[PDB]
């Protein structure tokens, strides 16, 4: 495994057959294993694509690795998904696991679907990052921010209190999977694509105000396109 090297104010690859002393490791505190946010590569954040990126495998056991502190994520996820028969799906997090420190918008999902396999796994192999431990597998509950890790040789409440967007899932891990936004105990809006957290956040302009607000014994789903809100377009 190659290490980044900072020298002549640029990155250099450690994997050479001569280690010239121009780079020196005076102490172990020059070492870093910092995590990086996958999102920083411009990777799409639509929740449907997030689902597309997870493998749903059974077979080989999960592993985790310790890593150095790293960059903030705008988007992160919490998951409650269960199998259609009401079986729990995906293991409870192991001791010492807690959600990532700085997500701006943790997305929370619940609902059921086939939830194939037992250990999930990222289709690209990207790490899930929980606090300071990278993982190859998704844990229940707590937030995982997709990312990668690198190793290099070195020469206020809103920072975590922010978080919006909780929604239901219909099916899971398959092409047929669908999501519906939920506010005020109302399931609504298909969330198909192209919606930033703020795009969705502004939809709360309708909550207890400009629309929706099913003041009935049950909740009504609106199909997103008022045209967008799709008020009274529920079926």
């Amino acid at each position: 495994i190659p290490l980044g090297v900072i020298h002549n104010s640029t990155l250099q690859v450690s994997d050479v057959d001569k280690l010239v002393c121009r780079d020196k490791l005076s102490s172990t505190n020059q070492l870093r294993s910092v995590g990086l946010n996958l999102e920083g590569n411009g990777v799409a954040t639509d929740v449907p694509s997030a689902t597309k990126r997870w493998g749903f495998r059974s077979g080989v056991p999960p592993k985790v690795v310790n890593y150095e502190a790293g960059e903030w994520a705008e988007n992160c996820y919490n998951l409650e998904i269960k199998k259609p028969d009401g079986s729990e799906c995906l293991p409870a997090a192991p001791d010492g696991i807690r959600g990532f420190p700085r997500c701006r918008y943790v997305h929370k999902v619940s609902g059921t679907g086939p939830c194939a396999g037992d250990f999930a796994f990222h289709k690209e192999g990207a790490f899930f990052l929980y606090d300071r431990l990278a993982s190859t597998v998704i844990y229940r509950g707590t937030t995982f921010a997709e990312g990668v890790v690198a190793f290099l040789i070195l020469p206020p409440s809103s920072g975590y209190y922010s978080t919006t967007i909780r929604y239901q899932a219909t099916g899971f891990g398959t092409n047929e999977t669908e999501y519906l936004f939920e506010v005020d105990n109302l399931t609504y809006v298909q969330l198909e694509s192209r919606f930033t957290p703020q795009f969705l956040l502004q939809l709360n302009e309708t909550i207890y105000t400009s629309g929706k607000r099913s003041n009935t014994t049950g909740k009504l789903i609106w199909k997103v396109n008022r045209k967008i809100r799709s008020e009274e377009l529920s079926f």
Partner: antibody
Amino acid sequence: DVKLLESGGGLVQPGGSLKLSCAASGFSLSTSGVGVGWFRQPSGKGLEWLALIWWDDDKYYNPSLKSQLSISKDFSRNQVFLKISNVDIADTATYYCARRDPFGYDNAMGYWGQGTSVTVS
Amino acid sequence: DIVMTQSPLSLSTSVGDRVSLTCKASQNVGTAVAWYQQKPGQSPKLLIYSASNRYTGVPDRFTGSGSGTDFTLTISNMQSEDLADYFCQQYSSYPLTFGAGTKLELR
């Protein structure tokens, strides 16, 4: 067009317990926001409410009976269930399952079960 | 919990009668109401949706009206096949409530 099917426990002693169930043989119940539920008609009486179940995992009960009533489901088999603690003569009734019919606006339910009945002795 | 009532509690009928029924409640239902029809040996089939739309496949003899706490169901040109126990229901609040029902007998 759903062939909802009634099912349930047999005759029980009063002070007993009851399990009731139904199934939607004509429908997966996988559409989000589907609501199903129960109501009963003792002695030819009107549609007393018992419970509501949502595909989105929401549960409701008639508070007067709620202390002895519980909702359960088994989606893999398109099943819905009730459990009743302390069943007695006041609980003898015809019983029915129900589903939203217009679907997705104002409940609109609506669609009904075949009907079953329960007695005690 | 919310009071629901209906009237007349029973009505004598004859063919071609314009039936008028009403449903009343303590709370302003706001038109989130539905009407139902029932016969012995049968489910309480839907008649009216959202205080207005008869359910699909219901004959157009069945119409209805009102808002808030007041609603009606009427039957144009009643036929003897329409004798039934009739009901109404509240969808604006819960626990769910329904009208006490009414019955008709031709004669």
